Amino acid sequence: MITDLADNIERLKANDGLKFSQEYESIDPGQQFTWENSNLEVNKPKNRYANVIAYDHSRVILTSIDGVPGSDYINANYIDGYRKQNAYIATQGPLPETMGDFWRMVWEQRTATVVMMTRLEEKSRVKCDQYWPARGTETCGLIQVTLLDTVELATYTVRTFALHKSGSSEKRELRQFQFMAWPDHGVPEYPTPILAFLRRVKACNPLDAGPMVVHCSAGVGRTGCFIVIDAMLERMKHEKTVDIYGHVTCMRSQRNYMVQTEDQYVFIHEALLEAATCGHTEVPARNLYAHIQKLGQVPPGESVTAMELEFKLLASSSRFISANLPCNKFKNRLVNIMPYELTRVCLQPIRGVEGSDYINASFLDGYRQQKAYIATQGPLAESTEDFWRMLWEHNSTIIVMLTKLREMGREKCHQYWPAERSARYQYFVVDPMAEYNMPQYILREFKVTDARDGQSRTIRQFQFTDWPEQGVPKTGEGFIDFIGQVHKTKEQFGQDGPITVHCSAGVGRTGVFITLSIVLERMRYEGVVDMFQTVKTLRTQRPAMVQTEDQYQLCYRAALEYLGSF
16 A cells, blocks of 8 residues: 555645645535534633634533533544544643643543643744643642653653542543644654654553543644544554545544644655555564564565665665855765754854854754754864864763774874863863773863853763774674763763764764664663664664664664663
8 A cells, every 4th residue: 555655645746736735625524513512602711712613513521510501511522533433532722721621521531641732832822721730739620630750752751640530539540742843833844753652652542541632722733633643553554555535534524624734634644654664663672582583584575684674775765055065075074974954063153264154963863852962973184173163062071982093094083182281172272181991992081161261161082992993893782881881971970962973974883872872771761672763763864874784783783782681
């Protein structure tokens, strides 16, 4: 169904995207509805937007609070899922006065998962009101809400609550997943991040849970996307097919404008095409050994190993204007590797210095935070000043070097740091303070001072020296320890900036470092490993992360290693 889907997407996308527009504007459930309850004088203040109501036939009705008019109303509607009516609940971002009603719907519908598709504030405008306690427990109407734990990751946050309805002994658990990676304007660049989010929500929604309640601002746009994508994912899994037009049409028959923009309709097509193309490449940790075993074999209709094809599929799946500027020609070590405009690390210009805002480096997202790493080439004599400028400007106080200064008779990296006496690079005077030479790596400490104001910081450089000049490490044991030292030292000294990582071109050895940094910790906290999605994602931030298949294989070997060390 992949080729079909991709093909269908091709004609709709053709000619300024004419047929997509025609198809989208054609969505029509063909029914006449009513919403008296939404328009009752008593209920109007309960609607976030007067033009976003709930159809009477599909609305989620709250049990009535006898003697209190309008008490059965909330702006929300049931939404059909794959092969099951009313599988979800689409609702608006609660208002201060509907907070108790919202939690009451959660209790009554036996909901175990809340999906928030918005930030509380976007573009300085209020999209939703915070309806959960920032700490401890609060009472919203008849429901006691206790915040138990919060886990903030790069693209989303998970809050775990305990619920109690006053007047009863029962205690329930509620998990809120808030997606933080949707752009202020338009839809997301790639579907990988939302696809991953969808995956986690599903893994954590218990088997006996009532309908998940999904919401954004009006509870029609982003909410509609998450729901239609989740339903279609469940379908292509059981039927290897997909009917986006039909489902959106069914959604609209249950609620106000589900999937409210044409661009959202396209994003939905793109997201499901990638899901069908990549499949689910995640494996539980306890199955890592077995998985690696199979990756070493040749699949049925294939010629090479499953491992080689997986890596090869990482490729198969001009934002280089600055890097290609004539004034920056000699600021690139290996010209086949240049930073994407979107994620290039920019520097403050210097009058009279052409391209003074350029350095061959990219911002890469980590497990718990975005821009947690700066992937860059081994500094050149020509870019050494720019390198130190970049570290101060972007507050990076942890440097990771993955090569020797020279290997195989050629320079891999220029010695951009002072060894004996102090040295100044632009406005920064760097004093060498300590150098610890260990069996497999070196740790150097530097005092860096801004001569303009006398402010200083301590910069720590970790240089792994045991990487074979040809090939890759055999076990990855020493490298794993190295990864732990770097991050332990960062947390220890409370350094909050990004970690700058470099090798030759900042994509190969640097790719293994960052890939493992993410994967090894996620395996520790989530019990799963998804090498493919990790590298696929890093590659949207800098080209060629994890350059060769043997480096990719080492990533798997090292994860297995770490797994056994538990």
